[PDB]
Symmetry: D2
């Protein structure tokens, strides 16, 4: 099918390695257009073997949308737009992204994508998981969809940098996390439980254990029952895929219909990636 | 309280009331029966102590709310097919009858609207019967949640009392009050809403039970399980319940649409005997 | 059976009415031995129609053990040993005894029994619930018992007057609750999961949602799964009974093997009972 | 580390690719000692690019142990020791291995390993999951371990070809499933919950929702809760890995310390593998 790029899917649910196009070089319109169609079709896409410069890097995210850095992550020197996912060899500190989630939904308008580029990865370990919230919502019964179709959910960063994160035990290392503000993190914002992708118009579920605190207008007692069920349902194995990282590998994931998570199976070893973050609109029903 | 011909004393702040000042051997005058009924629709369960009536007065009294309609699995006595047993020998390992919360025979397409029981031989202490109001079950939910589930229907079926899941269990029921009901009558499915309105009251309730409710219509076994388990957790709080204590010839009527009930099994070794008719009801609607 | 007192049990599981004894005038010893003997068999005991004085009251509790008032609750004018469980006819704030519990299990040595006296109670409503943790534990499979037999549980008063309590909604209105110390509130203390009664030597389960924070030495995830089960199992309806309050009814419950809770089925009304507390030694397996 | 074989691990938890040895030609002892030693460290091992015969296949497993075909699976013409994993492109009815499990544990001694060969697999789709029940066990608290250490569990083929399968909603397809004996299926068996692997002497948790009915000695309520916790815990994402199948790739997995499952994302596509099953001893604590 695809003509200007060679597209090799990873599973029957999400993901594809794309090859036969050099991201060091400016992309013509028919090449990049297919790149987009894949991303909107395969949700995560990665390009192995791309020795790009941080400038070519920022340039590529710019095609999807404006660079909108995430609050939390420290920038690389010189490029405020380029942020680290760096973890030193001396470990024992919370891993970033230890659980399934989408990135920073506590914003009123959270990112639409983010592109990661592997600098130094360990020979084995420190994979990254990805799962499809198209598949999450689509495997529900209509009766269930029609029941939960209308509900909205209250997100908040209190857990990752708010009140509850201040009254707990350990922290993140300061190698990729900025000192945050206790109240700006603890800030609420409301998103639907079921979002419509702006481009695909296909419907996905929208919730995660990192930021979703409760359903708007529900007693905690219900909200927990119901969100605990979705987390159970949406994080089945049959929905995921698993990216393995090799130097100069570059990846783009859709931050609205895919959740991701980092696997902490590399203690003792060094692991460094970089990532720009592309902006999005208020998530819409 | 505000009552003419009857002395009516509640049991809790939620449901239940004692009725006194009337002989149920004595066909009630009309000014009396109207005041009795107003309670039975506000206190949901009501009981009369001591009334040493008969199976001819007994059947007469159920007949006033509605027709005598025996329930399938139970047995009626020598001479009276209309009066059905709640009998347990002082030695029965056999399963207890009604030992989880339920409304009676909701797998019927139009399940009963009330039922009247009479203490024949009850122990002094032991064998109480519990009740909770599913109005208050539903009322204590957030509007948002009511808003979410008001439209769902639930598929009831007796496949647990006399269908496949009961035909392949362990201990069976006590064959004292259980008749040979069969496999196909049990496994038979039937659908009533999740949320019901009382015909007489215009109040909204809730309608589900761990004995007969199988799944939410149109939901995956895994969805239906989470949501129904949540609702039971919630409708069987202690705050919604009350507990009746039985003294021989205590005669009692419960509403089998806005209340659940269950038989507390604290008496094995004892003999415990009640009789019960079963006034018939309508199909229950949203 | 009982010769000096009239004993009419309430259920087959636990609970009993005692009659045929005048609690205003000192009890002869054979009468008090049968009183206690019932208290130890039936766990909860009530004496209806006992028009007693605050002095006969304290003297009656001192036959169970030295009177040590509980923190939190207010003492009556003139008697420090008598405590209020008073509620005005304005139902602004949260109820006392709202969920199943035993009294102050966060103490290192919590109360052994406590005696309540109905001052003025509503016509219908304002019940108190009771359940037997002998019955909880004896209904576990022998196999199950040996699994948990050895476990310990970390109790704490936070949620009632610690850091987690001063954080969320309502307070208790101070018509019977005193201002507490958060450092004693967050204070932790460790008891068995299965306690052997001092006097009867029968074993009871020992855990409650008000005070139990976690199983000693378990992961938050493990401990949560496990306490959830026991609370589900131990608060079945079949194990409970329901005492209905009438003026001058005097009640004694074993605060070691019975859990209790108070019903808010009396909103709008006025309900006032008073209560002394008999002390016990640290619970032992 | 490794000298006669090239061992490239797959995650930091379990899994390894083996290269630098031709499995068509007999193993010398120095080479085989390393192969086995790899199998025992990494639990799942696979070799890419091995165009072997049903005979070299069978020859290779006997090096692990005697081959005793698994009940259920249809064998290929000419080699009853070789069993099919075939699914035609006309595929709806239940997939084989749809959930996490160890293979046929209702036996009194379930296989210790099994070796699989990709005959013709789809370009993408139908990957196979693997998770380490060492890690299941290893991540429990010491306290928790001592609690569940002692228990035994009743496994049964009721669910796959026993009593309840003969009266459910849907069925299997006979391209690789045989007509099974109904009571032979309903036949029970008891294994420890925590097994000590013969060779490695490491301990693993041993339970799976496909075959485990209940814990010996517990009430349906107890047994139901406890395994639901253990299934939740042992099937975290962080414990798994994912093998992607490519033609003539040969895989060996340890059937006592790993569970596996088949991913049903190849609908419409054609997938065929072959597998011998190596025998084991009664599983021991
Ligand atoms: O950077 C982001 O958008 C948020 O990432 C996270 C997700 C889960 C957890 Cl537990 C912690 C972190 Cl920092
Ligand atoms: O005596 C104690 O410290 C324990 O008493 C209580 C426990 C729980 C609640 Cl909700 C209210 C009260 Cl008074
Ligand atoms: O370390 C990784 O795999 C990515 C960290 C992550 O998930 C994130 O960027 O939010
Ligand atoms: O209380 C009882 O024992 C009987 C109640 C019951 O289960 C029924 O009549 O169906
Ligand atoms: O208010 C009641 O009836 C009892 C409440 C309670 O649990 C207590 O005072 O310890
Ligand atoms: O196709 C697969 O992944 C294997 C099927 C399976 O589960 C088994 O071998 O038992
Ligand atoms: Co009933
Ligand atoms: Co298998």
């Amino acid at each position: 099918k695809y003509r200007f790029i060679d597209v090799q899917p990873l599973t029957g649910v999400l993901g594809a390695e794309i090859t036969g196009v050099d991201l060091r070089e400016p992309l013509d319109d028919s090449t990049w257009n297919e790149i987009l169609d894949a991303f909107h079709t395969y949700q995560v896409i990665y390009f192995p073997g791309q020795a790009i410069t941080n400038e070519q890097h920022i340039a590529f995210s710019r095609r999807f949308g404006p660079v909108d850095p995430v609050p939390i992550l420290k920038s690389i020197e010189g490029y405020p737009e380029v942020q680290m996912i760096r973890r030193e060899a001396n470990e024992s500190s919370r891993y970033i992204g230890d659980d399934w989630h989408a990135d920073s939904t506590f914003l009123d308008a959270p990112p639409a994508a983010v592109v990661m580029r592997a600098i130094e990865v360990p020979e084995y370990g420190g994979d990254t998981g990805f799962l499809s919230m198209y598949s999450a919502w689509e495997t529900l019964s209509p009766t269930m969809q029609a029941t939960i179709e209308g509900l909205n959910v209250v997100h908040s960063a209190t857990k990752v940098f708010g009140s509850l994160y201040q009254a707990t035990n350990w922290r993140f290392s300061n190698t990729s996390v900025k000192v945050m503000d206790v109240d700006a993190g603890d800030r609420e914002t409301v998103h639907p439980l079921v979002v419509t992708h702006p481009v695909t118009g296909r419907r996905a579920l929208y919730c995660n254990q990192v930021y979703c605190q409760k359903i708007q207008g529900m007693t905690d007692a219900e909200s927990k029952s119901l969100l605990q069920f979705l987390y159970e349902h949406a994080t089945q194995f049959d929905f995921t895929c698993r990216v393995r990282w090799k130097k100069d590998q570059v990846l783009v994931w859709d931050n609205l219909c895919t959740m991701h998570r980092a696997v902490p199976d590399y203690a003792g070893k060094f692991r460094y990636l970089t990532r720009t973050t592309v902006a999005g609109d208020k998530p819409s029903r």
